[PDB]
Design an enzyme around this catalytic site. Structure first.
Site, PDB file in Angstrom:
ATOM      1  N   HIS A  81       0.827  -1.188   0.000  1.00 42.65           N
ATOM      2  CA  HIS A  81       0.000   0.000   0.000  1.00 42.65           C
ATOM      3  C   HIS A  81       0.891   1.279   0.000  1.00 42.65           C
ATOM      4  O   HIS A  81       0.394   2.291  -0.243  1.00 42.65           O
ATOM      5  CB  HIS A  81      -0.903   0.006   1.259  1.00 42.65           C
ATOM      6  CG  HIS A  81      -2.242   0.678   1.111  1.00 42.65           C
ATOM      7  ND1 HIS A  81      -2.951   0.705  -0.068  1.00 42.65           N
ATOM      8  CD2 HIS A  81      -3.058   1.224   2.053  1.00 42.65           C
ATOM      9  CE1 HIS A  81      -4.137   1.270   0.147  1.00 42.65           C
ATOM     10  NE2 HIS A  81      -4.230   1.564   1.430  1.00 42.65           N
TER      11      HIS A  81
ATOM     12  N   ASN B  71      -8.680   3.739  -1.439  1.00 38.24           N
ATOM     13  CA  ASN B  71      -9.120   4.613  -0.260  1.00 38.24           C
ATOM     14  C   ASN B  71      -8.303   5.853  -0.030  1.00 38.24           C
ATOM     15  O   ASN B  71      -8.752   6.819   0.660  1.00 38.24           O
ATOM     16  CB  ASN B  71      -9.205   3.676   0.980  1.00 38.24           C
ATOM     17  CG  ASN B  71     -10.424   2.714   0.840  1.00 38.24           C
ATOM     18  OD1 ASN B  71     -11.515   3.157   0.435  1.00 38.24           O
ATOM     19  ND2 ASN B  71     -10.246   1.445   1.100  1.00 38.24           N
TER      20      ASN B  71
ATOM     21  N   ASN C 100      -6.041   6.767   4.299  1.00 42.50           N
ATOM     22  CA  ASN C 100      -7.460   7.140   4.094  1.00 42.50           C
ATOM     23  C   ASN C 100      -7.787   8.558   4.377  1.00 42.50           C
ATOM     24  O   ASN C 100      -8.902   9.016   4.119  1.00 42.50           O
ATOM     25  CB  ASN C 100      -8.390   6.202   4.837  1.00 42.50           C
ATOM     26  CG  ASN C 100      -8.220   4.728   4.455  1.00 42.50           C
ATOM     27  OD1 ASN C 100      -7.540   4.387   3.538  1.00 42.50           O
ATOM     28  ND2 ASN C 100      -8.800   3.824   5.288  1.00 42.50           N
TER      29      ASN C 100
END
Length: 193
Positions: free
Chosen positions: A22, A116, A70
């Protein structure tokens, strides 16, 4: 076309997320920064780490939000607004579940595609920024998505990703010089050697 003047890498802060998939965006921007000798410093005003310097004859800012993924908009939005940088001069590098390791694409516009971090950005600056979609693979099911993006890739997949990132890095000159269609063609054509 607009020259790219702000390059953002998406990811999570801390040593426990540094090697996870990520943070593909962070890998790209960190490596770009050191390639050109741009120093990334703490920039609490904008909830991130940022730098600025010359890349191939153009003055470019580099940003890594330190908001957690996020909440990335809480850095990207006020930073881009403060320096009056339009979305069309922004490139956001991020992990892309829908592409395999070793695949990389440059995209202009569109929505978040479920990502996200991008979800936190599109609402506020609109969609017309450029994205470097770094393929990280999809694990197999909606259930395993979180453990996959939040996990460290095995060394084979990691080499594939690193190869892809090295290629995009070599195309940054076209991006900063305003050459986006050429850069898109040339990035999007990559296949692992």
């Amino acid at each position: 076309m607009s020259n790219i003047s702000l390059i953002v890498g998406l990811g999570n802060p801390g040593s426990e997320y540094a090697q996870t998939r990520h943070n593909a965006g962070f890998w790209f921007v960190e490596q770009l920064a050191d390639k050109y000798g741009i120093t990334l410093k703490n920039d609490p005003k904008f909830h991130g780490i940022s730098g600025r310097g010359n890349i191939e004859g153009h003055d470019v800012r580099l940003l890594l939000p330190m908001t957690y993924m996020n909440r990335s908009g809480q850095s990207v939005v006020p930073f881009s607004k403060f320096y009056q940088i339009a979305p069309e001069a922004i490139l956001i590098a991020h992990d892309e579940l829908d592409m395999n390791p070793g695949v990389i694409r440059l995209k202009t516009g569109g929505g978040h595609g479920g990502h996200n971090g991008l979800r936190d950005i599109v609402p506020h600056i609109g969609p017309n920024f450029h994205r470097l979609r770094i393929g990280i693979g999809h694990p197999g099911s909606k259930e395993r998505v979180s453990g996959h993006v939040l996990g460290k890739a095995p060394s084979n997949e990691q080499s594939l990703m690193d190869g892809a990132i090295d290629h995009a890095l070599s195309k940054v000159k076209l991006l900063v010089q305003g050459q986006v269609p050429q850069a898109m063609n040339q990035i999007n054509a990559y296949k692992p050697a």
